[PDB]
Amino acid sequence: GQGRDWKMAIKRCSNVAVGVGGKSKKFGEGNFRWAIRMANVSTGREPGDIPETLDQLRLVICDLQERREKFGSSKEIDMAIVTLKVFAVAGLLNMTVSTAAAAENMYSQMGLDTRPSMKEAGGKEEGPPQ
């Protein structure tokens, strides 16, 4: 979460509004680091584990929504989930969305809330460490 791809994705997200205003503040880099870190700890991943691909990010979001379903919603888990969806849609897919609500809606319409099977995925991501 320090490379050129990370920063460009963050730059894309910086124009997205947190609230469905209007007047609303926009997302900042720290918001994404917080959301990833929160989701990582919550799902038993190493805290600094940055998703590199859309597939990896989708699985984190899936794990976190399943946690939300099992143990219940909260202002914090809800914010983490929507923040990750903004990262997927505006960051990784480079899609113009005005608000976090719009990203959430787009993420859902594209079918991304579905957790793909391992066979569906074709194969996990197995590559060199550096």
Numbering used by the authors: 4 to 133
Question: Which sentences did the original study use to describe this structure?
Answer:
Matrix protein (MA), p15 in FIV or EIAV and p17 in HIV or SIV, is the N-terminal subunit of the retroviral Gag polyprotein. During the viral replication cycle, the FIV p15 matrix protein oligomerizes to form a closed matrix that underlies the lipidic envelope of the virion. This myristoylation, together with a highly basic patch of amino acid residues located at the N-terminus of the MA, directs the Gag polyprotein to the plasma membrane (PM), mediating the association between Gag and the inner leaflet of the PM lipid bilayer, where Gag forms a hexagonal network. The structure consists of five α-helices (numbered h1 to h5 following the HIV convention), which give rise to the close packing of adjacent helices typical for retroviral matrix proteins.
FIV full-length p15 protein at 6 mg/ml in MES buffer pH 6 crystallizes in the presence of sodium acetate pH 4.6 and PEG in the space group P21212 with one molecule in the asymmetric unit. The three amino-terminal residues (Gly4-Gln5-Gly6) and the twenty carboxy-terminal residues (Met113 to Gln133) are mainly unstructured and extended. Despite its intrinsic flexibility, the C-terminal end (Met113 to Gln133) is clearly observed in the electron density map because of the stabilizing crystal contacts of the C-terminal residues 130 to 132 with the complementary monomer. An analysis of the electrostatic potential of FIV full-length p15 revealed a highly basic platform, with helix h1 having amphipathic character (residues Arg7 to Cys16). The first interface (interface 1) implicates the conserved residue Trp37, localized at the center of helix h2 and the C-terminal end of a contacting p15 monomer (Gly130 to Pro132).
